[PDB]
Write a protein that binds this ligand. Structure first.
Ligand code: HEM
Ligand code: HEM
Ligand code: NO2
Ligand code: NO2
Lengths: 182, 182
């Protein structure tokens, strides 16, 4: 039961890179494939362009009644139908991290409705949130979404809605890595 | 600016071990000294007995008005007179970590008054909170306190008040390493 996940862009992996969109700030080099490994990488293989890593952690903002709503409808990863995925690494500004817990919760849910908006796109979209600021990585979060092609248009709508939120005014680096399951 | 810290119990270090208290659950081996290093150490040196590590992280529970109170009084580390120190690794239960953010905040402060009680022992006591559950370590937190002998009795009071709090019903492993600055 290891909470560390690595994402290595390169020639090998379980996922074909469809495209990479460098939304904001320095991007990620285009590669053929992404290899996802659970655990800490011993040595990065040859012909790898980049390595991202993060860990699964405890809830930081969601309250019990939100967790109950998410749990009632959120799908599992690895659904046979979920052949599309998107890896989105995200970095938030130093202004964000300086803020107190009540100030960040108010932006996250009261002003931006992150959980309420996201719930609109379940059960179509499965997700996994990983943290990596505390590892000294270049991003603060590795977010992961997977879904069937039927939900691609919906997911693209969700992305536009989130980037218009107050919360995203604190995002200062973002890349979309679009993937297809091999 | 590396946020990782390592505490190596052994025969070298900047701190002499006065005593080790095996408060709850498996203890830590008694050693002569503790060595504190900033950064991640990959090879523990020979005739060291244990290594603890954690990182400095963002605020998880404190609200803005509590941060302002803490900042008004909390003392710096490495005060000339702060020749005593206590390193207290703590592990919380699986039931704690499964709880939602509002549930944990209400136990932490509304019921246990962690911050309000701690502020009573400032500015005598300087402190540093490190996290390590997300590193896969045996403990969840490494807490560090340092003060002059004048505040030894006050700090021992604080410990007894905290161990009787609702929050401590979720602690399942705890060790006190009492130190003296060399
Ligand atoms: C698909 C529906 C989604 C749902 C149901 C959802 C739900 C959530 C929840 C409940 C959290 C808080 C976890 C906690 O309390 O620690 C969270 C965090 C986060 N989500 Fe989402 N989310 C969705 C989509 C997205 C998308 C599309 C993105 C990025 C484009 C995203 C980026 C993030 C980030 C960066 C965080 C961490 C926030 C922080 O800790 O500051 N989420 N999400
Ligand atoms: C000396 C006065 C103290 C003050 C002013 C104080 C203040 C605080 C504050 C404000 C936090 C929350 C940090 C955040 O929001 O992320 C915290 C966390 C914590 N403190 Fe203290 N504290 C004190 C003493 C102690 C003592 C003596 C112990 C152990 C015996 C302790 C154990 C912890 C633990 C384990 C956490 C992490 C709680 C969690 O995230 O679940 N504290 N402290
Ligand atoms: O909900 N962001 O993984
Ligand atoms: O307040 N725990 O360092």
């Amino acid at each position: 039961p290891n909470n560390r996940y690595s994402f290595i862009g390169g020639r090998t992996g379980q996922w074909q890179v469809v495209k990479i969109r460098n939304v904001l700030g320095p991007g990620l080099q285009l590669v053929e494939k992404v290899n996802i490994l659970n655990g800490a990488v011993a040595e990065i293989p040859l012909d790898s362009a980049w390595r991202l890593q993060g860990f699964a952690s405890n809830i930081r903002y969601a309250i019990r009644t939100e967790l109950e709503a998410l749990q009632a409808v959120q799908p599992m990863l690895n659904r046979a139908e979920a052949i599309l995925a998107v890896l989105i690494p995200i970095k938030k500004s130093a202004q964000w991290w300086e803020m107190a817990q009540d100030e960040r919760r108010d932006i996250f849910e009261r002003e931006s409705h992150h959980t309420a908006v996201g719930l609109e796109y379940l059960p179509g979209v499965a997700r996994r949130l990983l943290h990596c600021r505390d590892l000294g990585e270049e991003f603060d979060f590795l977010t992961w979404f997977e879904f069937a092609p039927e939900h691609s248009s919906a997911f693209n709508e969700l992305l536009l809605r989130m980037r218009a939120s107050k919360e995203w005014e604190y995002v200062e680096r973002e890349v979309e890595v679009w993937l297809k399951r091999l």
